[PDB]
Amino acid sequence: HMKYIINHSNDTAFNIALEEYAFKHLLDEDQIFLLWINKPSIIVGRHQNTIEEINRDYVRENGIEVVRRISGGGAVYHDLNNLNYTIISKEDENKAFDFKSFSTPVINTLAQLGVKAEFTGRNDLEIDGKKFCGNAQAYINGRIMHHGCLLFDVDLSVLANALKVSKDKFESKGVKSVRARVTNIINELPKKITVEKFRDLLLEYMKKEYPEMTEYVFSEEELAEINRIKDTKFGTWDWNYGKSPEFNVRRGIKFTSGKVEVFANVTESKIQDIKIYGDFFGIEDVAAVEDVLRGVKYEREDVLKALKTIDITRYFAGISREEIAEAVVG
Predict the structure, then answer these.
(1) Which of 89, 191, 253, 289 is 20 to 30 A from 70 (CA-CA)?
(2) For residue 254, which of 123, 131, 74, 56 has the smallest C-alpha distance?
(3) How many angstroms from the chain centroid is the CA of residue 87?
(4) Which residue ranges make up each domain of the chain?
(5) What is the Cα–Cα distance from 25 to 3, expressed in whole angstroms?
(6) What is the layout of strands, in order, in the sheet containing 41-44?
(7) Are 50 and 241 in contact (CB under 8 A)?
(8) Residue among 69, 123, 73 at smallest CA distance from 98
(9) Domains 1-242 and 243-330 alike in fold
(10) Cα four-point dihedral sign 29, 34, 38, 42
(11) CA-CA distance, 276 to 286, in Å (whole number)?
């Protein structure tokens, strides 16, 4: 049960709904691959405090969509020259279909085109030391998604104009990360082609690599369900931005591997409710950490103790339990 999906819409909210539908709803297909393209868009991480990150007037003046995705991390700019990829797989020790496995097809497609690309660390591809691809992983029970962006000819100047600096205070508790080197594929190609051509060469490669893989074609009924998810999630303010929580405490700390913003309601010296925002990356939803902290004593020691009962690396990559405790409580 290995499939690809062809989706040529540029409707950001529709596209993201369709990807989620494949990830969460096409459970009889063990491996799913797709390539797709959004119109100009700021895509925000699953836990970002959207209202405090977006330049409202810029995105409005310029017609840019704002949609929250279902993986962690920070804000990303999409345009018609940003090629999105999606790799979905049933969790199975005896069969790996993931970013690593896609990376060879990308490298080889590019080598056909006269371009030497390299797989660096874990979650990016490079050309001459410059990153043109950035991967992120999401995990639900028994199912893994690796998804990301291939920079084909993106306008790299827009993001900085579309984002703002919050007036809310953050303690800056570390050093800042080094500025990465990025490039667009089109600039590295000896001969010019379009992003659509590149997309189709990649798919043609995938088909050659996996002769088993056939097209999954959505029925009218599935398309309806997909649009329902668009109408109730990715097309809504409640999802993309969302309601403020009940809180009598707010804290904010910027760590090297991410900003962490904590809104806690503390009653009778205990965590009555808590909600955590930020641009930290974790493979799984931070709700699980909120859940373990609820009813805990609002003291550093007790919060820390609770955090040592879970795998912190699933939720905050590169940030320690001690650091998260500090974000939660003084």
Answers:
(1) 253
(2) 74
(3) 13
(4) 1-242, 243-330
(5) 14
(6) 65-68, 41-44, 76-78
(7) yes
(8) 123
(9) no
(10) positive
(11) 7
Q: How far apart are the first and last CA of the chain?
A: 51
Q: Which two tokens stand for residue 303?
A: 């919060």
Number of helices and strands in the chain (H, E): 10, 15
Alpha-carbon 271 to chain mean position: 29
Which experimental method was this entry solved with?
A: X-ray
The alpha carbon dihedral of 21, 23, 29, 33 has a sign of positive
Q: CATH class for domain 243-330?
A: alpha beta
List phi, psi (to 5°) of 22. -60, -50
Sign of CA dihedral 43, 46, 48, 51: positive
Q: Tell me the residue type at 302.
A: D
Nearest to 274, CA basis, from 226, 310, 320, 325: 325
Q: Resolution reached, in Å?
A: 2.0
3-state secondary structure of 173: coil
Neighbour-count burial for 43-69, b at 16+ CB within 10 Å, e otherwise = bbbbbbbbeebbbeeebeeeebbbbbb
User: 101: burial class by Cβ within 10 Å (0-12, 13-18, 19+)?
Assistant: middle
The encoded tokens of residue 197 equal 């051509």
Helix%, strand%, coil% for the chain, nearest 5: 30, 30, 40
> Which residues are within 8 A (CB) of 96 and not within 5 positions of it... i.e. 6 or more apart?
89
Give me 276's structure tokens: 């955590």
Length of the chain: 330
Say which residue the tokens 């090297």 belong to: 256
Cα-flanking dihedrals φ and ψ of residue 258, to 5°? 150, 150
11, two tokens: 């409707």
Contact assessment for residue 286 and residue 274, using Cβ atoms and an 8 Å cutoff:
no
Residue 231 CB partners (closer than 8 Å, separation 6+): none
According to DSSP, residue 193 is labeled -
CATH class, range 1-242? alpha beta
Query: DSSP letter string over 125-167?
Result: EEETTEEEEEEEEEEETTEEEEEEEEESS--TTHHHHHB---S
